[PDB]
């Protein structure tokens, strides 16, 4: 659930492709969405 440390490190690589997105770093950004993504289905499949 939304307490779950879980759903912080999602929260936490989303403000770091936005402070990559500030520096144009469109490599890292669309890798890191790849890993954002990883995280979101492991998070809203698992049970909590």
């Given at each position: 659930?939304?307490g779950?440390?879980?759903?912080?490190?999602?929260?936490?690589?989303?403000?770091?492709?936005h402070?990559?997105?500030a520096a144009?770093?469109?490599?890292?950004?669309?890798?890191?969405?790849?890993?954002?993504?990883?995280?979101?289905?492991?998070?809203?499949?698992?049970?909590?």
């Open positions: 659930g939304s779950s440390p879980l759903a912080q490190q999602i929260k936490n690589i989303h403000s770091f492709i402070q990559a997105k144009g770093r469109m490599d890292e950004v669309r890798t890191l969405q790849e890993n954002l993504h990883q995280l979101m289905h492991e998070y809203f499949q698992q049970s909590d």
